UniProtKB/Swiss-Prot annotation, chain A:
PANTHER family the UniProt entry points to: PROTEASOME SUBUNIT ALPHA/BETA
Source organism: Homo sapiens (Human)
Any one cellular-component term (Gene Ontology): proteasome core complex, alpha-subunit complex
Protein name as catalogued: Proteasome subunit alpha type-7
Primary residence: cytoplasm
Cited InterPro entries: Ntn_hydrolases_N (IPR029055), Proteasome_alpha (IPR050115), Proteasome_alpha-type (IPR023332), Proteasome_asu_N (IPR000426), Proteasome_sua/b (IPR001353)
Pfam families with a match to the protein in the record: Proteasome, Proteasome_A_N
UniProtKB/Swiss-Prot annotation, chain B:
Subcellular location(s) per record: Cytoplasm; Nucleus
Gene from which the chain derives: PSMB1
Record keywords, A-Z: Acetylation, Cytoplasm, Deafness, Glycoprotein, Host-virus interaction, Intellectual disability, Nucleus, Phosphoprotein, Proteasome
Disease affiliated with this protein: Neurodevelopmental disorder with microcephaly, hypotonia, and absent language: An autosomal recessive disorder characterized by microcephaly, intellectual disability with absent speech, severe developmental delay, short stature, and hypotonia. Affected individuals also manifest aggressive behavior and have hearing loss.
GTP-binding recorded as keyword: no
Residue ranges of the TM segments: none
PANTHER family: METALLOPROTEASE TLDD (PTHR32194), PROTEASOME SUBUNIT BETA TYPE-1 (PTHR32194:SF2)
Modification type Phosphotyrosine: residues: 122
Quaternary structure and interacting proteins, as annotated: The 26S proteasome consists of a 20S proteasome core and two 19S regulatory subunits. The 20S proteasome core is a barrel-shaped complex made of 28 subunits that are arranged in four stacked rings. The two outer rings are each formed by seven alpha subunits, and the two inner rings are formed by seven beta subunits. The proteolytic activity is exerted by three beta-subunits PSMB5, PSMB6 and PSMB7. Interacts with SERPINB2. Interacts with RFPL4A. (Microbial infection) Interacts with HIV-1 protein Tat.
Modified residues (N6-acetyllysine): 176
Name of the protein: Proteasome subunit beta type-1
Originating species: Homo sapiens (Human)
Gene Ontology BP term (one): proteasome-mediated ubiquitin-dependent protein catabolic process
Protein family: Belongs to the peptidase T1B family.
UniProtKB/Swiss-Prot annotation, chain C:
Subcellular location, record wording: Cytoplasm; Nucleus
Name this protein carries in UniProt: Proteasome subunit alpha type-1
GO cellular component: centrosome; cytoplasm; cytosol; extracellular exosome; nucleoplasm; nucleus; proteasome complex; proteasome core complex
Subunit: The 26S proteasome consists of a 20S proteasome core and two 19S regulatory subunits. The 20S proteasome core is a barrel-shaped complex made of 28 subunits that are arranged in four stacked rings. The two outer rings are each formed by seven alpha subunits, and the two inner rings are formed by seven beta subunits. The proteolytic activity is exerted by three beta-subunits PSMB5, PSMB6 and PSMB7. Interacts with NOTCH3. Interacts with ZFAND1.
UniProtKB/Swiss-Prot annotation, chain E:
Name by which UniProt lists this protein: Proteasome subunit beta type-5
Assembly mode: The 26S proteasome consists of a 20S proteasome core and two 19S regulatory subunits. The 20S proteasome core is a barrel-shaped complex made of 28 subunits that are arranged in four stacked rings. The two outer rings are each formed by seven alpha subunits, and the two inner rings are formed by seven beta subunits. The proteolytic activity is exerted by three beta-subunits PSMB5, PSMB6 and PSMB7. Directly interacts with POMP. Interacts with ABCB1 and TAP1. (Microbial infection) Interacts with HIV-1 TAT protein.
Full-protein positions shown: 60 to 260 of 263
Species classification: Eukaryota, Metazoa, Chordata, Craniata, Vertebrata
Keyword annotations of the record: Cytoplasm, Host-virus interaction, Hydrolase, Nucleus, Protease, Proteasome, Threonine protease, Zymogen
Species assigned in the record: Homo sapiens
Reported impact of residue 49 to V: Displays high resistance to the bortezomib, a proteasome inhibitor of the chymotrypsin-like activity
Record EC number: 3.4.25.1
Subcellular location: Cytoplasm; Nucleus
Family that this chain belongs to: Belongs to the peptidase T1B family.
UniProt-annotated binding residues for bortezomib: 49
One of the protein's GO biological processes: proteasome-mediated ubiquitin-dependent protein catabolic process
Length: 239, 213, 238, 228, 201, 240, 215
């Protein structure tokens, strides 16, 4: 019955440790991810500088390939291991079949790794949940998410971590088909999501984009200040 | 030193007709300049619709025969149905490549019916390729038997000779004549003839003797 | 009651209860009856279904040209011992180029099932084997048990409510030895029709008959060569 | 008590397979019907979000050119067993030049549906429906986590399967046609689902002996739904 | 044995003979050499029957698995790469294999050339076998890019005729396959003596 | 007591109860005796039919390990079968590495060590068997040994294993065991087995007798008991 | 074994009406030196079959050991089933084939003679696993020398008596004593009928040398 161990079912038909492992993901930092028509964009919140150190090591958004990007929630160490494995897998695929790695393949890899990692003997399942964003086939934007169970599940927009119910609940009554991207609208959608964050402190927003042909662009918190100002301008025009 | 192989020789014929696959073979098993026996039939009845012949190195012939019988029983006892002819052909090709780097010194010819009820002769090689042909001769008497079949079965190199389908009794008397004519000039042929006929009604056999030297 | 946990533990009365629990796991299979003449061995089982539309779970499974088993209980261990059985049959068929004597095969089954009843990490096999075969000395009807204490009999019946079957086998084991195939098989289903509650009758699609003969290869039957076997019966004496 | 797989009950039984049969029930429903004309198959997706892309959730996947599938419950084992059975079919075709029949496919699957063992892992949490066209025409098979594999004429799995079986036994007979069976299936679907039936809820899977390739209907599904 | 393959505007032409000898003795006249991997890929048989047959059947297996995992066709360069990596693991153990991989890509035409020595290369025309040099000669006479369909057919047919005419190890039926964008289709299987009567005058 | 789950644990007074509980598992098992004459060893087992289902000739507890050695087991039957296979294997190794028949002392010591190794570790249980071992040799005479579930293996003239372990050897020891050849000892074993438990708790038993010695020239086999039919015509004269 | 040290020589075996007679000699030559001129080269297997070998004598001892073990095992099963001679032939062939397949061949040339259930049996096993049945077997140089005598009389008369067969074996062994350098004038006859297995003593031959008075 009881929450130990991973192997044994519940008396009413559940796996506890998979269900308990998602609470770690829900009890972590928040990060959203959207795809426009041609630009894909995501970003983590809660930069949370402590005034006595650098933050260039604590980066939660990285890349495995020149077509794909990372993002996660939950605890950080599992994310470190999963990313360091995923890079090696991406290069090993590149050593085979000479294509750029399709995002579907690397998500199947990560989910399969985590899955056979879950079924095994007394091993602690990874308390993370990734966002895997890439545009490969003719520049078609894709973004998939994981689960501690290991079920990849393709979305068009996403919200994980703390408050993610409300953070995703904003996305229905903002996300239109119209239009299109229109990269500025995609950016403003990211800005509306960051202003829609649980805190939206103003300076703790760190977002990074990809225009489906370039490499990752790390933004600058003066452009984001103009973004917050023009969001406030539109909010005042609503009155 | 130790040699792994010895040439035992032998002769295997096969003719795919319209609805019949006749496979015949002599029963002389020899070595060097000796005779070990005058009865060792190269034909083996696998199913009611598949007969295999195996010549060459005799021990590998025995081993291969028994392995094929084992996998036949495995497929049947797993999947409630007998194999086809081409299924057995593909399986034999997989096996012969599965011992690529220590080859069987064995020629192989499978006759039998297809799923249409027509003859199908699958030839082989010692390494494991195959093809669906109309007639093949395997063994030392291959060169003594292929061109005559080209003259009669293939009707090749002739003028104004129409094409009659190969009937049964015509094929039977052809097999008897090619084995007499090949046994006259070859040293690895004689003393019997084991003719196997695969119809839509089972497997018949027939024994025709030869000259005793 | 804490001694009743694992295979390793001896009880303070010496009766390892995992074996008894495996026996009771055998008792919840389908009913099956096996019996031999001097020349022909027949084992007849009963099929069951999950619903009406579904097909019926078969019990007699073929093994070899002269060996056939019945089964009761679990199906996973059934197919596992089937695989091992066929493996040993074809192995001796390959090496010695002979059919197996049955008794040494069943001793191999006992030695196979001995280790999972002795060490830790594997459960005993809930299994209901009724083996029919032909060595040089004729037909044999063996049974196993999950405690690996394989028996030889002349008429056995294991499963659910198999006891009335055993009483019938008791009162006709003298009659069994003389007859030919037809009334032998109908004695077998004259055990099965008392392995059922009396308000429903044995139809075609629920029964399975497997004959092995001294010159006859082992063959399974279902509904179509069983309609010749199901005629020639009277009603139960209501 | 009952705490793991290596222990029976006094009366029967385990009590881990039983919990697997329990764990099936949380999943979404599915209904497959064998007709001699061909095997039809239906499922429900239980779509949560509008951001949830519907064609990315798989229930009906492809095994062979004539062998479909449907899954249940736990998605995990429902991916694992598919990835095995695909390889199995390819090994069979490789060494045999022919199509592994559906019963033999499920034998290959249930040869390790229960090989569950952590030493010498846990039992799997999925019920599967297999449809295909062998030499005997159409075939519809139903397995379970326990490996106790049987053929079914028209099987209904997962959630709300009780009334599904009852109302299914109401309508079925042996001499059905195809389109009647299709609409008969989706009637039962929209009596057991909760949302409105539309173009995005369900997805069909119909394999015919002359139409072996493409066992699928895409947005003619809309036309089939609107005919009720 | 002589195979050739050249790609052009409207796809890829593949042709070969059908004679496979055994030493100084001809085994058969109708050995189908162009091994059909897919309805979108075509492989050949260039030196050694067993190695070509076996490894291309294994590659066909791998392509089918790749498709059923990604719901999408494999590219040509991918398959050539996988075949070279599989073949490399027995180097020096005595495998003879010189096959070619043809097929239509997301890029369009695709033509690679995989050896048991591992010479995986792209290119425009190729020719493998003992009498391959004869085909090189007459092909690189007749080669262009803007050729027509019947014109490339006559080029390949003439090429294999010259090849089987000067070499001893070549003859039999002239296979001729044509790769399109949608899928490959056999053109014709013509006998050498018919070609001799037809093109001799 | 408590203190008795694992086979590796001791008690606060110092004994292993798994060994004890396995020892008294054979207490409920069938009665099996053995006695040796001056030129052979005779075995005998009180064997019982279940009800009517048996075949009088199944599951014989009189095993036959080597050409001149065979067992007379009592306890759990399948464990005894496996133990017999181990003994056959050990004798085959000795025959293959030394070319001659196994001496019974060495065989008993190897088998006792094998039983002991099963008594040691915690993953495994002790055996639920107790068996007899008989031999004959022209250079050695007759040896009769005895192996408990623990593995303490030494020798006897007579022994009894089963319910009536004391109740047989109360009158096994009043035999004139030395001065008799084994053809007298046949009907002696017959009367001993026939005395214990004719009808009281159960219904029917049945008699098997194994037989080794000089008269078989070193062979070990079951008697032709039906030849000279020694039990019943003497058993009916032993009820009075 | 790459290099056979101690070879035997030719073994003769032939069926007759309800029995098979085998006779091989008792010579243990090494090189050309007849180092062991008194050894046994026929094992008497249990009651029906019977083995005779040539080649490396140590390998024959090894096979004697293994087969004696197997036969004692099946007899100690107590089930009433023994091995057919043909099962022995099959097992020996499989063993030799698997032994040569690992490139470590058993240098032997063996004859299995058995009589079981009305039918005589006479089998051959080579080093390479070449194996067959025959109405008459001759190993070594005997296949060159005495084999035409067997195939002459069996073509002259397909069945034989025990007396006729024994005489023919005697004459063939005399011939082998004449023109085989690895021969010796002391051989033993083994005979199986349904009365069991019987090995005769070390018989000798009677020679002629009257040609030596010619120049």
């Amino acid at each position: 019955s009881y929450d130990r161990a991973i192997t044994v079912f519940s008396p009413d038909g559940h796996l506890f440790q998979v269900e308990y492992a998602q609470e770690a993901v829900k009890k972590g930092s928040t990060a959203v991810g959207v795809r426009g028509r041609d630009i894909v964009v995501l970003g983590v919140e809660k930069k949370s500088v402590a005034k006595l150190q650098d933050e260039r090591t604590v980066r939660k958004i990285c890349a495995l390939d020149d077509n794909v990007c990372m993002a996660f929630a939950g605890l950080t160490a599992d994310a470190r291991i999963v990313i360091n494995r995923a890079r090696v897998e991406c290069q090993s695929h590149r050593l085979t079949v000479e294509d750029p790695v399709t995002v579907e393949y690397i998500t199947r890899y990560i989910a399969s790794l985590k899955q056979r990692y879950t079924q095994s003997n007394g091993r602690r399942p990874f308390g993370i949940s990734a966002l895997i964003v890439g545009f490969d086939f003719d520049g078609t934007p894709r973004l998939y998410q994981t689960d501690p169970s290991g079920t990849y599940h393709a979305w068009k927009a996403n919200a994980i971590g703390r408050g993610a119910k409300s953070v995703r609940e904003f996305l229905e009554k903002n996300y239109t088909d119209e239009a299109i991207e229109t990269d500025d609208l995609t950016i403003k959608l990211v800005i509306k999501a960051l202003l829609e964050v649980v805190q939206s402190g103003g300076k703790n927003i760190e977002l990074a984009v990809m225009r489906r042909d370039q490499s990752l662009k790390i933004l600058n918190p003066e452009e984001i200040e103009k973004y917050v100002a023009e969001i406030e301008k539109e909010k005042e025009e609503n009155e | 030193r130790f040699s792994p192989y010895v040439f035992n020789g032998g002769t295997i014929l096969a003719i795919a007709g319209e609805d019949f696959a006749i496979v015949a073979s002599d029963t002389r098993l020899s070595e060097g300049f000796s005779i070990h026996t005058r009865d060792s039939p190269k034909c083996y009845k696998l199913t009611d619709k598949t007969v295999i012949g195996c010549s060459g190195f005799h021990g590998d012939c025995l081993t291969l025969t028994k392995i094929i019988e084992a996998r036949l029983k495995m497929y049947k006892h797993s999947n409630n149905k007998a194999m086809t002819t081409g299924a057995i052909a593909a399986m034999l090709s997989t096996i012969l490549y599965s011992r690529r780097f220590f080859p069987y010194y064995v020629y192989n010819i499978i006759g039998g019916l297809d799923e249409e009820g027509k003859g199908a002769v699958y030839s082989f090689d010692p390494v494991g390729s195959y093809q669906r042909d109309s007639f093949k001769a395997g063994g030392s008497a291959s060169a003594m038997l292929q061109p005559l079949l080209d003259n009669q079965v293939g009707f090749k190199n002739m003028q104004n000779v129409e094409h009659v389908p190969l009937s049964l009794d015509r094929a039977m008397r052809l097999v008897k004549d090619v084995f007499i004519s090949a046994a006259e000039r070859d040293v690895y042929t004689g003393d019997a003839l084991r003719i196997c006929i695969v119809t839509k009604e089972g497997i018949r056999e027939e024994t025709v003797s030869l000259r005793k030297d | 009651n804490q001694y009743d946990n694992d295979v390793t533990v001896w009880s303070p009365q010496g009766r390892i209860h995992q074996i008894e629990y495996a026996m009771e796991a055998v008792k919840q299979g389908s009913a099956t009856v096996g019996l031999k003449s001097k020349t022909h061995a027949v084992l007849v089982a009963l099929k069951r279904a999950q619903s009406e539309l579904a097909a019926h779970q078969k019990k007699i499974l073929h093994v070899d040209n002269h060996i056939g088993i019945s089964i009761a209980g679990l199906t996973a261990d059934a197919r596992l011992l089937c695989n091992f059985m066929r493996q040993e049959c074809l192995d001796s068929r390959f090496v010695f180029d002979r059919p197996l004597p049955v008794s040494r095969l069943v001793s191999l089954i006992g030695s196979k099932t001995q280790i999972p009843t002795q060490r830790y990490g594997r459960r005993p096999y809930g299994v209901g084997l009724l083996i029919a075969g032909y060595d040089d000395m004729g037909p044999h009807i063996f049974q196993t048990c999950p405690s690996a204490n394989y028996f030889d009999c002349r008429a056995m019946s294991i499963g659910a409510r198999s006891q009335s079957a055993r009483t019938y086998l008791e009162r006709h084991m003298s009659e069994f030895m003389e007859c030919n195939l037809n009334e032998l098989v109908k004695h077998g289903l004259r055990a099965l029709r008392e392995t059922l509650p009396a308000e429903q009758d044995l139809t075609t699609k629920n029964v399975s008959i497997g004959i092995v003969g001294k010159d006859l290869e082992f063959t399974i039957y279902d509904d179509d060569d069983v309609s010749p076997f199901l005629e020639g019966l009277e009603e139960r004496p209501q | 008590y009952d705490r793991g797989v290596n222990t029976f009950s006094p009366e029967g039984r385990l009590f881990q397979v039983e919990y697997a049969i329990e764990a099936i029930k949380l999943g979404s429903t599915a209904i497959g019907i064998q007709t001699s004309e061909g095997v039809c198959l239906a499922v429900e997706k239980r779509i949560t979000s509008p951001l949830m892309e519907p064609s990315s959730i798989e229930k009906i996947v492809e095994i062979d050119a004539h062998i479909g599938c449907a899954m249940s419950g736990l998605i995990a084992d429902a991916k694992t067993l598919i990835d095995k059975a695909r390889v199995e079919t390819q090994n069979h075709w490789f060494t045999y030049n022919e199509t592994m029949t559906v019963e033999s496919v499920t034998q290959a699957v249930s040869n390790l549906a229960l090989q569950f063992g952590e030493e010498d892992s846990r039992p799997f949490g999925v019920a599967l429906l297999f449809g295909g066209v062998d030499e005997k025409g159409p075939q519809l098979f139903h397995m379970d986590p326990s490996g106790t594999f049987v053929q079914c004429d028209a099987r209904a799995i997962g959630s709300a399967s009780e009334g599904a079986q009852s109302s299914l036994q109401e309508v079925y007979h042996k001499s059905m046609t195809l389109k009647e069976a299709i609409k008969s299936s989706l009637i039962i679907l929209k009596q057991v689902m909760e949302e409105k039936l539309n173009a995005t809820n369900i997805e069909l899977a119909t394999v015919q002996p002359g139409q072996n390739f493409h066992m699928f209907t895409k947005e003619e599904l809309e036309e089939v739904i609107k005919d009720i | 044995t002589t195979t050739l393959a050249f790609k052009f505007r409207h796809g890829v032409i593949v042709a070969a003979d059908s004679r496979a000898t055994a030493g100084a003795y001809i085994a058969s006249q109708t050995v189908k050499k162009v091994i059909e991997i897919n309805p979108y890929l075509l492989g050949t048989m260039a030196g050694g029957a067993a190695d070509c047959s076996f490894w291309e059947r294994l590659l066909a297996r791998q392509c089918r698995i790749y498709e059923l995992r990604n719901k999408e066709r494999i590219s040509v360069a991918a398959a050539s790469k996988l075949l070279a990596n599989m073949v490399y693991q027995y180097k020096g153990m005595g495998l003879s294999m010189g096959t070619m991989i043809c097929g239509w890509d997301k890029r369009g035409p695709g033509l690679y050339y995989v050896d048991s020595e591992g010479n995986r290369i792209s290119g425009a025309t190729f020719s493998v076998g003992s009498g391959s040099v004869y085909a090189y000669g007459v092909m690189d006479r007749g080669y262009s890019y803007d050729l027509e369909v019947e014109q490339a057919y006559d080029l390949a047919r003439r090429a294999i005729y010259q090849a089987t005419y000067r070499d001893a190890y070549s003859g039999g039926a002239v296979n001729l396959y044509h790769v399109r964008e949608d899928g490959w289709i056999r053109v014709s299987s013509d006998n050498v003596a018919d070609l001799h009567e037809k093109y001799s005058g | 007591t408590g203190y008795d789950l694992s086979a590796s644990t001791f008690s606060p007074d110092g004994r292993v109860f798994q060994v004890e509980y396995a020892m008294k598992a054979v207490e409920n098992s069938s009665t099996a005796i053995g006695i040796r004459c001056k030129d052979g060893v005779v075995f005998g087992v009180e064997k019982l039919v279940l009800s009517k289902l048996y075949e009088e000739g199944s599951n014989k507890r009189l095993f036959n390990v080597d050409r001149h050695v065979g067992m007379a087991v009592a306890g759990l039957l399948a464990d005894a079968r496996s133990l017999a296979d181990i003994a056959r294997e050990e004798a085959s190794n000795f025959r293959s590495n030394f070319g001659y028949n196994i001496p019974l002392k060495h065989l008993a010591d190897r088998v006792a060590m094998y039983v002991h190794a099963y008594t040691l570790y915690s993953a495994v249980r002790p055996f639920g068997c107790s068996f007899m071992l008989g031999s004959y040799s022209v250079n050695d005479g007759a040896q009769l040994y005895m192996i408990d579930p623990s593995g303490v293996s030494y020798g006897y003239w007579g022994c009894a294993i089963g319910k009536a372990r004391q109740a047989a050897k109360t009158e096994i020891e009043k035999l004139q065991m030395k001065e008799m050849t084994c053809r007298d000892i046949v009907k002696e074993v017959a009367k001993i087995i026939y005395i214990v438990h004719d009808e009281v708790k159960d219904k029917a038993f049945e008699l098997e007798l194994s037989w080794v010695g000089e008269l078989t020239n070193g062979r070990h086999e079951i008697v032709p008991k039906d030849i000279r039919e020694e039990a019943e015509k003497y058993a009916k004269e032993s009820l009075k | 074994t790459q290099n056979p040290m101690v070879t035997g020589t030719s073994v003769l075996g032939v069926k007759f009406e309800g029995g098979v007679v085998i006779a091989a000699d008792m010579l243990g030559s090494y090189g050309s030196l007849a180092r062991f001129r008194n050894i046994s080269r026929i094992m008497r297997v249990n009651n029906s079959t019977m083995l005779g070998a040539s080649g490396d004598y140590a390998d024959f001892q090894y096979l004697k050991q293994v087969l004696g073990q197997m036969v004692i095992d099946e007899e100690l099963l107590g089930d009433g089933h023994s091995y057919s001679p043909r099962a022995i032939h099959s097992w020996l062939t499989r063993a030799m084939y698997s032994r040569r397949s690992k490139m470590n061949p058993l240098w032997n040339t063996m004859v299995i003679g058995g009589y079981a259930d009305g039918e005589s049996f006479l089998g051959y096993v080579d080093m390479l696993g070449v194996a067959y049945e025959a109405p008459s077997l001759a190993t070594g140089y005997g296949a060159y020398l005495a084999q035409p005598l067997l195939r002459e009389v069996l073509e002259k008369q397909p069945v034989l008596s025990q007396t006729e067969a024994r005489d023919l074996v005697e004459r063939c062994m005399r011939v082998l004593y004449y023109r085989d350098a690895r021969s010796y004038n002391r051989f033993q006859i083994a005979t199986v009928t349904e009365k069991g297995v019987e090995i005769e003593g070390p018989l000798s031959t009677e020679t002629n040398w009257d040609i030596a008075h010619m120049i």
